[PDB]
Amino acid sequence: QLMVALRVRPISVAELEEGATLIAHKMDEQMVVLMDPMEDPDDILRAHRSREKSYLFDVAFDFTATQEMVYQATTKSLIEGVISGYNATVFAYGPTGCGKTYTMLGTDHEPGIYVRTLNDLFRAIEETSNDMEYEVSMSYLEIYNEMIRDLLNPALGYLELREDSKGVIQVAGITEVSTINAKEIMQLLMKGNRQRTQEPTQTSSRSHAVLQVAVRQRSRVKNILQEVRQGRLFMIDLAGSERASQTQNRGQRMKEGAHINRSLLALGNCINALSDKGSNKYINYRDSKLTRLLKDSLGGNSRTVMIAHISPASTAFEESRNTLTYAGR
């Protein structure tokens, strides 16, 4: 069961100075159109065949939506399931500068999905600790060129995911920080983030940040057995696909693009399999990194939420068209 959202960030000053116009438009609460701008010395077109193309999503947002509104429309509903033992996943997807980190982390003035979700999580827990015992743990790490960082413990840089007795993949050694408040979770991500590989030339356009929250629930009634539940929420902020011909990436850079492109392909192969057929033959989780971690999650009785991001800027038309196509339902 998959949900796909598209977020349009407001246009930027840098874009206006480059001379960009608005070509992306929320038309509808779940429809976005993308105007084609134009540029000679062609076109042999007009003969347009658009001009304008439409795109539909489970939900859509532009600058009118607040942080809280995107939270409420994307991930709030996941919470009930997670504390009940079900698994869930939220991706921020899109090109660099289109909004991923803002949607997921937010700012002090404007908090994103991480904290709004952690918040309703702890309230949901209290509202039901009459009946239930709960344990909550969260971690915040980085995957950069298939190499982990933990974001906390400084001594590991190559963690390999291992299977338990029931074939469930899970990162081995991955630190696990106990968090008793929202102010602590934010500090952990801010203190650990600095570790996230940045642009050798700013964060690296190749850095996944994974926030994972684990929740164990058992009954307070002891004279009746009942299953002990364990839900796992993954909240992920990634980078963008790189056309290596452009950029002209070499060595550390050249190889860097090969990975990101590989991981995004793998991910695309996994979500495509989950969306369609069908036993299956087994959904290709074994494709690559970021997948080893998400293996036991993302399956039959688990939820996925993808939030695609674009610029509304004319100067971004090609990227936006790729994004809209990819996420387009």
Numbering used by the authors: 11 to 211, 215 to 342
Share the article's original sentences.
KIF19A, a kinesin-8 sub-family member, is unique in that it possesses both functions, MT-based active motility toward the plus-end and MT depolymerizing activity. We recently reported that KIF19A functions as a MT-depolymerizing kinesin in the control of cilium length. Thus, to elucidate the molecular mechanism of the dual KIF19A functions, we performed crystal structure analysis of the mouse KIF19A motor domain as well as cryo-electron microscopy (cryo-EM) reconstruction of the KIF19A motor domain complexed with a MT. In the catalytic core of KIF19A, the KIF19A-specific feature of adopting two different interfaces for MTs and tubulins is utilized to achieve the dual functions.
Finally, we performed cryo-EM analysis of KIF19A in the nucleotide-free state complexed with a GDP-taxol MT. Cryo-EM reconstruction at a 7.0 Å resolution clarified the interactions between KIF19A specific structures and a straight MT. It should be noted that, presumably because of the weak or unstable interaction between KIF19A and a straight MT, stable and full decoration of KIF19A on the GDP-taxol MT was uncommon; the occupancy of KIF19A is thus lower than that of a tubulin-dimer in our reconstruction. Thus, we finally created an atomic model of KIF19A-free on a MT that has the similar L8 and switch II conformations as KIF5-free and the similar L2 conformation as KIF19A-ADP. The L8 of KIF19A-free on a MT moves to interact with H12 residues of β-tubulin during binding with the MT-lattice and the release of ADP from the catalytic core. This movement is accompanied by approximately 7 degree counter-clockwise rotation of the following helix α3, as also reported in kinesin-13. The switch II α4-L12-α5 of KIF19A-free is retracted to take a similar conformation to that of KIF5-free during MT-lattice binding and ADP release. The length, the location, and the angle of α4 in KIF5-free fit perfectly to the corresponding cryo-EM density of KIF19A-free. This means that KIF19A is able to adjust the switch II conformation to fit the straight tubulin interface on the MT-lattice. When KIF19A is on the MT-lattice, therefore, loop L2 interacts with α-tubulin through the hydrophobic tip and basic cluster, though the acidic cluster will not contribute to the interaction with the MT.
